[PDB]
Paper text:
The coronavirus 3C-like protease (3CLpro), also known as main protease (Mpro), plays a crucial role in processing two polyproteins (pp1a and pp1ab) encoded by the virus RNA genome. Inhibiting the catalytic activity of 3CLpro has been proven to be an effective strategy to block coronavirus replication. In this study, we have identified mutations in SARS-CoV-2 3CLpro that confer resistance to WU-04. To understand how these mutations affect the WU-04 sensitivity and the catalytic activity of 3CLpro, we solved the crystal structures of these mutants and aligned them with the crystal structure of the WT 3CLpro.
Two strains carried double nucleotide mutations T10200A (3CLpro: M49K) and A10547G (3CLpro: M165V) in the viral genomes, whereas the other two strains carried double mutations T10200A (3CLpro: M49K) and T10955C (3CLpro: S301P). These structures demonstrate that the M49K mutation disturbs the local structure around the substrate-binding pocket of 3CLpro, but the M165V mutation does not induce conformational changes.
Residue numbers in the entry:
A (entry chain A), B (entry chain A): 1 to 45, 52 to 304
The structure:
């Protein structure tokens, strides 16, 4: 029992983190096989093609712990740089580059100067930002999920937006959302609450014995989505209902019966109660996150 | 910017986790040098000295991944078993066994069948329980902090109490709190809120631009502690004030001025606002946790 914001074990990613320096700019890179991936803004001191043509392999200092890696080639792929090095990382895990959807979660290994500092969980917001914890020097830190032995890398950190939320790319160098690795007035757009995740977390609450918000009522999908729209919640789809199936079965509470609980919570608040130790409705746990934690996969 | 529940990178601990089986009971062990540490309740099927005298080395099956470790000796140290094995763990980090105080935080690497599943942060409660996330098979999972290259192990998981909170030992096998590794009606005592940590988190909020709860007032330590007692908060000491010094300096808000903010929040609530994304006062971040995250140590 219990329910925590739980990250994946970070060891497989720690062995991949290196430091990349170009000029006076130092940030983090990801060393997989004989390539180091890092944000292309490491070469700034704003046409990146010009900036990179002016660089040579020797302008990139790559440090893996106490070992300096020799750069033998460099190329740009969207907003990431690929630095080919003369040695393949012996600690390279089985890995994939996967782009995630808004609403999905991942673990972040925050690093500075190539050294891992901490690991935490977060979600891709509907507005394509993440509410991370990053300080200067954290660029190049990565987000990932782990399945069996395979690390699925989904995020590389590039930018802090004016509200203090964060933006970045997939590992192919393509930004999540309408953000750029340049100096503009860019800002996060309006965000919404991830409805399917709130429902998942209410199921986690029930599994853990918080039942006070339950009721005998059941709503219809259309009737619930009318309320979701009013409270700035994402629409709930039949696919979302199907995805919640396993949790609905385990608790014996139909999805649309839980939706009636959510409707009431939205219209009346909590009346001073808490759910899983929170006084707000939590939306950064996916259905998979709940199953994983209330079943125990390793 | 941003502020997350952030665990230490778990790699150094992952390389130490093994599976220990005795009879039909399987749980986790910690393999450091040529010793595997695990909960002594692995030998149950309630005088532990008798139970262990009846066992032999061959009754303990220890698996480190795909490798079976041969047990060459066994002894009991308080509530932990020490299984001497014929091979020293080549991945043993620099480590220490340190017992923590209520109010202090640590990272938990939850494991099942010797395999790490997730990592999260938690605090030792004033009542010596932890609000963890553990399922069947998680016994023997460990809690730790990391400083530079050194893993300070502080917790090993043994028991789930009736309210779903958790109890365990230090790595010398001594329980935190008045709990036992036997079947009794034991239950967590009344808990309190960790005041110094709430203040630390309010400083984190200020550092991150949440200032709405600030005021021009300053209270006295005695006057604040009168209010803390009424709201089931731990007393605040001059040492706590001194420990908060660095955060008070960085923000320019004196500790007793922040105490005036806490007093108001306790007496009036939040009026529908949030602090660092929470509608409750958070007490599971120490002053060190705040400095570490709002400064960037690795």
């Amino acid at each position: 029992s219990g329910f925590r914001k739980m990250a994946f074990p970070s060891g497989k990613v720690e062995g991949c983190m290196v430091q990349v320096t170009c000029g006076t700019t130092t940030l983090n890179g990801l060393w997989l096989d004989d390539v180091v991936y890092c944000p292309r803004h490491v070469i700034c001191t704003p046409n990146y093609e010009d900036l990179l043509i002016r660089k040579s392999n020797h302008n990139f200092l790559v440090q893996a712990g106490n070992v300096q890696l020799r750069v033998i080639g460099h190329s740009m792929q969207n907003c990431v740089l690929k630095l080919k090095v003369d040695t393949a990382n012996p600690k390279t895990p089985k890995y994939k580059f996967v782009r995630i959807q808004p609403g999905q979660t991942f673990s972040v290994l925050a690093c500075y100067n190539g050294s891992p500092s901490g690991v935490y969980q977060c979600a891709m917001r509907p507005n394509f930002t993440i509410k991370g914890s990053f300080l200067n020097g954290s660029c190049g830190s990565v987000g990932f999920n782990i399945d069996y032995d395979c690390v699925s890398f989904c995020y590389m950190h590039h930018v802090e937006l004016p509200t203090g939320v964060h933006a970045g790319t997939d590992l192919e160098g393509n930004f999540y959302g309408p953000f750029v690795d340049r100096q503009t007035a860019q800002a996060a757009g309006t965000d919404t609450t991830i409805t399917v995740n709130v429902l998942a977390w209410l199921y986690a609450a029930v599994i853990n014995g918080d039942r006070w918000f339950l009721n005998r009522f059941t709503t219809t999908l259309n009737d619930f989505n009318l309320v979701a729209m009013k409270y700035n919640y994402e629409p709930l789809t039949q696919d979302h209902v199907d995805i919640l199936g396993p949790l609905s079965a385990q608790t014996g509470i139909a999805v649309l019966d839980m939706c009636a609980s959510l409707k009431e919570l939205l219209q009346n608040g909590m009346n001073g109660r808490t759910i899983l130790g929170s006084a707000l409705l939590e939306d950064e746990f996916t259905p998979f996150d709940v199953v994983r934690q209330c079943s125990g996969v390793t």
